[PDB]
Structure 1
Amino acid sequence: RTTDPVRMYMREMGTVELLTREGEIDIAKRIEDGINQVQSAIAEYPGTIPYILEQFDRVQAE
């Protein structure tokens, strides 16, 4: 019905309701949960911890 991409863009973004404070905290908690699961999955690796340990060894030596 229209040819201007701007109007189609606004149509597409207007289909989702606006979020509240609690929604923001909920989404941030989901992001942190995903990051925590990824970190836990990587931490179960024999080669991951030695890298962090040697990086700390170099850092502590100034």
Structure 2
Amino acid sequence: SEIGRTTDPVRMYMREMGTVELLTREGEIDIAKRI
């Protein structure tokens, strides 16, 4: 775990941002359908 290792808020943001995977053409459609 990389927790407690850096000070950069850019690295912290990219780190927590990359834990969500991209959607397919079909993933956007049923998320929009859920909305």
TM-score range relative to shorter protein: 0.7 to 0.9
Query: Offset at 1:16?
Result: 1.0
Q: What is the CA–CA distance in structure 1 between the aligned matches of 2:32 and 2:22, rounded to whole Å?
A: 16
| Structure 1 residue ranges, 4+ long, deviating more than 6 angstroms after superposition | none
Give aligned pairs, total.
Answer: 30
Q: RMSD between aligned alpha carbons?
A: 5.9
- Larger Rg computed on CA atoms: 1
Identify unmatched segments of 5+ residues in structure 1: 30-61
Q: What is the CA–CA distance in structure 2 between the aligned matches of 1:6 and 1:20, rounded to whole Å?
A: 26
Higher relative contact order (CA 8 A, sep 6+): 2
| Paired position in structure 1 for 2:20 | 16
Q: TM-score, normalised by structure 2?
A: 0.75
Q: Which has the higher helix share?
A: 1
Identify unmatched segments of 5+ residues in structure 2: none
